């Protein structure tokens, strides 16, 4: 039954008694001990009448405490908080701008039905209130009302009410009118604030100077939703935004930049003003990357995108995007992404020595990303390919297992874009073959012997090594080793009549992988039909024997065994 | 905008919270606790989008302060606000610690109705606030290295050595699991280097595993740890974790007593780790009842055999990548008529080695500084290794 | 057999703890924390049984309080769940409409009640009549 | 009681911070230490109170590094309240100091030796509670003497019997099977059901190692059990809980009986069958109260009786009746009775006298799973379906699992998907059923489907002309949902590349609709996936000359031709050069249907 739910003794009896103590100093302590209770999930339900009695006071701290309590019920139990309506109507009448706002916020955080009857007329008082704390409060409470049922054609009067509040003494009321209205905006029909607005923007770009740092953030965001029609329209908005090169460190600079990017392309491209703007954004972006580690993250993610479009904006400032040992991994990587995208022919001196500085550290994860990111510094810029391949064969010699296996992979992705060039390397590279456990790095070595099977006599006695445990290999390897040993055959058809049986016989006859089986057969049928159409499909361009092919394909059959 | 604010302890228990919109009920508080606070196998970020809803978190000492917004909103703003909140709190009670949050429940409610209306960053600066806020805060309050060491080459090796222990029900419930770890360092460094060591936040600073950490005597504390290492090999730290372990293998047993004559056994094992990583020396030890006639055993990966003396089927696999699956099936005959009370089953046990720390410990940095001598960090060669090993890794059947 | 009996609150604060097994104080702390974790999750649509380490826990919530018995896997779930309710009825009569504070201010009396109804990990006495009669006899001694 | 104690506690409650709490505990710790050490001695009220306050503190968390000696003196008080608080302290705080265990075993002796049952109970309880080897060596000899003696009181007999039980478990060598054996068995006849309850706990543990010694328990256990279950309203009023007679002693008695085979005397085996038939009968009688306490008490006894029946495995009528009663629980409010029902039925499925009875309830198990909220009950449902499943059920069970998978949560898919694949293979009525199961398995829940599995289904489809059109249409119709599993796009793509010709007839499924569908999955897929799709795309240039143009466009794109991946770059270049550098007549034999798989014993048939 109701075991341990008595209200005739225990912690609730004692509280209900403290809540009725005529010494208000003990009532205050009661309502705290109740608030503190809710927080650890006690059923302070029985007390509601006694806590709401405590409101019958001319003490500010005591009333405010009772609010805090009903608020906690607002979000979880909206039904419970309905019961104290008559209080919130009356508590906007109170001659204190502390209580007035406090009655508003609490009605608008109740989310049921009846609420409309009581709330609409007192919000009228507080929008035309003699205090800008009660104005900034109602301006947000309009938003809360639009969020409950009924679009309300009187709420179409509250839309004027809000626009009316954009013109105001206080930019913290302007501030929360912008914010309020653009939230309201992106709901119900579309096109519900694009006024004439050149004085609207004008109130906003005056606002954007003397405003509390969060007012700007709400502003700049709406500014960024608009398309100017002409040059000097957009080009002037820009001029007044110029000073948001600091404000609320990041939450501003960025919402500024967002605008200055939109209104730099609806600039002619002229290189008249365009030019002045572009050397003005280089400082303020780079300031964000010394604040709190988490914002550095959000900056680098907007920079990366920004630098996809306008790489020259920070061509100059690649120096302030290198990595520090103590940077959070998620910052190390976003930085690494941008370094790759600022890699001129000038700075690869620096960069490719800062990528080496990394690949030598203790963080295995980041280290792996750095040596791949060297590949990216060879693929993107042909010049430095020779310097890059230097760094890689340096790390290969520190003998660090995981640095060796990532490096030997990138090298291959280089042999693919810069062929028949690097080639005295293949004989250095196979000095590390014994310990290549990662199945990526294996396949890379297999394909490198694939191509360049004629630069190496040794090729025959390596490809055989990896066939010994054909299964227990990455199917990735089984596919690279298939292509490689049909590549060795289409180059030395004789001493490699050996290796084509087994591989083509293990693909066709031993493996259950249909995709591998398929390719065994697809290759086996290519050598069978005519070993000259096989030649041309399988090998690309440069940078009548045939008897010795056809004597060898008439010799090979394929068995499970 | 900021649809919800939640403050958790190291356990992931919501100390204090306030929802603003109605997209952010029981559905929200949890998704953050599951996907981020108790994120096993992910290296996170500050931003975590989870089925429409977005999550922003900063971490203070043992606290998670977390913002939710079902709509996608000014990322940078959300962050900036949190840092200002943590500025407004500390201005009333100093450290943002579990205790001070607990002392100040009522204060903190009062700040949240002010600093943030319907999720909109308001005057969150003290001077402005002394006027709207009634409550005040409740604040509360060399021996192991020789002089003159030199080496042509300065190298250091770090070995992360973990043993992972599991008991799991046949339905896959984690009954109990602990990791026992240590970081062995092998340092050939000239001089008297001060070392600064950094890692993730995974190690907090018939028997029942307690999360504990001990360091070498050479270790000083303030986050990261610094020290002058002993020369050569030595043990930097020893530890045991219980929370948020990455279990490398799930064993799924399917035993079926067909009367008391035949015994049908299928065991499936599923490697739960990144597809690029290989576990090694894998062994599965399926026990058999004391009264076993013959055994038929078929497996398609590895090899396996019935070992009568050890009263068990032993299955061995050389390598096995992540996100793979393998099956052994056995048909076991029984000649019974013994006691009415049937076979009380011992659990299935694995061995394996894996190249990561089942605790999720990761070595982030090791800066070496030597005041006198030539060399610096850039000059030092640095291997890290991760060896994770099966401890007692038991699944009931 | 019974391994331990816990009375805990939503907040996690232990109100009674009785051990029928050897544990280091560190272990006891871990075990009390681990239990609060398991049981406070579960909505009133879950079972009152749940496997726990190499035993299992039978629990029911009365107001702000979780009554928990940790027992061997083979032990009868319904017997032990009604053992909890029988215990709570005895507490309810002894303390005249029990409340969490009774269990605090009279913690040492509560151990008496436990030891009447449970001992050496086994149910001892189930007769509410007999236990009260004993409890009121004891209460009147010097 | 102790005005002092209540202030310390209520002071600790007013503390607005861990800081102030610790301030208040150290103040109280200081005071206690001062007064123990202090010049003027303390009256018993104060030794009692401050010893109590040390206990409290220790229970909040704090180390207590004194007071043990004060607690030990209270053991020698002749005031009950003082003894209790002293006996309480040493049971919670067990210290190793040998001077104290000597003094403690003294106080215990002086209490056992008083003929006062309140003082004897505290001492017996202290022993059970602490259970130290010194306490066993001191008292293990005496406890059996107290238990059997004819003049020692019931309350003391209960507490002695459980004390002796702790002593046997902690220190068995100090409890040999002496001259008391049979007199402890005689307790099972006592007027006092509390004594019976105690003795039954003790005999049950003792009868595991020493079954022969306690044989004579079986008969008295049955006599008592049958007197209890059959008794009226006005019988056993003391031991009657929500209209259920002596439920915890019923459960104990049926547990004792699981220590032995079915009774050797028929008359007894008979009393026992009447006894269990009564218990199962009470399960068919409607509630005597709507209070859940009546149903749980009743069922506690039912479930124990079912353990005994299962364990005897000797009376097929009772195994069937047990099964059917469990069947009727699978439909029930109580998640609890649902959980325990499916558990017991899993056990009964592995006995023969009952395996067939269990199958009966397939209807109720599948219906209970379809509606079931609590996940652990769902799991147990799927374990039962898996246990009862043979040649007869296999189709029904597989079908019903695949149905559940459609709407199922993630919480359970992995284990169901595993069970489907296993049963599919063990109980294949034919190729076409297998293929239909695995293609649907992969369509619904491919993410959890093994590689080994989807490899096999393809092997089947290749080797059987009959099912290739089925495979092509099912996998096609599946592939054109808005989202689908990557493992379906592998099985889908491979099938259509090899057998898409048999559905290309329809304008529903033309080569250009086929291709564009596959390729609307492509850029979303993993690299091995995209590789295979490329082989599908080249098999497609061959079969369907119409769309060789569109396909060559996708092979010529820089995203294919200049791909970061090596299989992809190589396949897209090889496959482009094939659709150019070869005539019709060469390409037709380089991509002819693949030859049927070598059919080793590993799988079929
Ligand atoms: O309330 P009681 O249980 O009867 O005990 C109190 C109490 O003892 P504790 O607080 O240490 O338990 C002390 O008064 P407070 O500290 O509660 O104010 C005080 O002892 P001291 O004043 O010597 O510290 C007093 O003794 P006194 O008679 O000297 O006031 C003593 O009451 P009794 O001595 O009557 O038991």
Author numbering:
A (entry chain BBB): 4 to 546, 557 to 574
B (entry chain MMM): 1 to 141, 159 to 222, 239 to 255, 261 to 435
C (entry chain SSS): 1 to 142
D (entry chain AAA): 9 to 613
What do the authors say?
Proper operation of the pivotal CME cargo adaptor AP2 requires membrane-localized Fer/Cip4 homology domain-only proteins (FCHO). The AP2 complex, composed of α, β2, μ2, and σ2 subunits, is pivotal to mammalian CCV formation, and its deletion is embryonically lethal in mice. FCHO1 and FCHO2 are similar in overall domain arrangement —folded N-terminal acidic phospholipid-binding homodimerization F-BAR domains and C-terminal folded μ-homology domains (μHD) separated by a ~300-residue, low-complexity intrinsically disordered protein linker, which has been suggested to participate in AP2 activation, although how it does so is undetermined. We dissect the network of interactions between the FCHO interdomain linker and AP2, which concentrates, orients, tethers, and partially destabilizes closed AP2 at the plasma membrane.
